[PDB]
């Protein structure tokens with residue numbers, strides 16, 4: 001019986017659910033966007049028919065109205081089911097307050113080791129800022145963002161390999177760099193412990209537009225943007241050395 | 251020198267936040283699932299109307315058939331998208347993996363009450379009248395997922411309750427099934443009031459009041475349904491509506 005380990009398990013589980021929660025926001029957003037493309041196509045081809053059949057007997061008009069109804073019902077479903085759940089969530093609210101950066105980094109380090117990296121035989125080499133720098137930011141959201149980047153890099157790492165966790169903080173920006181060497185086999189291996197589900201670990205390997213990050217990292221991107229900072233990573237691919245970078249103003 | 255009789259406050263805070271994210275997670279998967287199921291009927295109806303148009307335009311100008319082919323290509327593109335953009339992301343809550351193990355029920359019921367009171371019910375001035383099972387009953391189930399399911403049902407009933415109202419919570423063993431009941435009186439005004447504390451976001455509480463098919467649970471209760479089904483059990487609740495008395499019932503087999 002250990003209540004301090006109970007707390008770390010609960011916090012790691014909380015953070016994994018937050019990362020999965022932001023991934024589902026991306027899925028809803030992508031689903032809403034991608035499902036409209038065939039609808040636009042159905043509509044514009046139906047418009048071609050409407051125009052060429054303005055002089056149509058009742059049965060042709062009824063059938064064309066059937067096509068139009070099928071389109072309208074899909075539009076309303078997308079509005080009602082995929083866009084509505086994100087009405088107020090699209091803009092991420094945060095609460096900035098000062099906190100000592102180094103203890104948060106220490107806690108993050110300890111948490112990823114406790115919850116995944118130790119089990120996975122992935123070492124984490126940490127380079128942490130000296131002195132006692134502080135940051136005005138949402139400590140809980142930054143904690144989640146740091147945990148998500150670091151845990152994603154551990155997830156992409158095979159046993160015996162290392163992840164580097166370097167964080168700096170000058171007068172301009174506080175920047176966290178997490179670097180890993182990507183093992184696609186370990187990332188997909190059902191036999192190994194994982195923090196994220198299989199879809200998130202598959203989705204990671206897809207290519208995407210430059211503005212976009214892996215969906216399991218969506219929390220990091222939105223937290224970075226809410227603080228007026230940035231988040232980026234190089235593409236995950238087998239054998240790649242990938243750095244994930246989180247910068248927020250100090 | 252205090253004597254602890256409940257989980258520490260910082261642990262209750264982390265559990266509440268964890269469980270609230272899990273519930274929100276299953277809600278979004280429920281939206282994806284709703285879209286996946288409900289897109290099929292319009293697409294099927296369009297397929298039939300396109301066949302009707304094809305016959306009725308059989309000897310019309312061939313570009314008209316090309317328009318119809320374009321419509322049909324769209325229909326088929328939409329069908330092809332459903333698996334990848336709606337079904338693939340929700341796959342692991344759709345079939346929730348669980349680990350069943352024996353655990354004592356009453357300590358979990360007690361921890362759950364402490365959690366809901368600490369996180370929401372006390373601030374909302376809602377009384378949870380609890381009746382706890384006699385004896386030392388045990389359950390072979392996924393304790394963490396049952397904890398989450400119980401927390402979600404109770405917290406939802408508290409979300410529906412105005413200040414000074416009551417939520418009744420009781421557990422029974424009906425045959426081979428072990429059933430937890432939660433009963434509340436629904437105040438739509440309290441569900442929507444932004445001056446009140448809330449565990450779930452405004453959309454989840456607005457969605458609770460939407461009208462759906464009876465087979466469909468409120469989306470904020472999706473976690474409860476998925477956890478129930480994963481255990482080979484059931485989750486039932488009446489529609490949330492202003493002024494209604496609503497019972498939520500979670501039934502799982504007592505032996506995995």
Ligand SMILES: [Co+2]
Pocket residue numbers: 033
């Ligand atoms: Co577009």
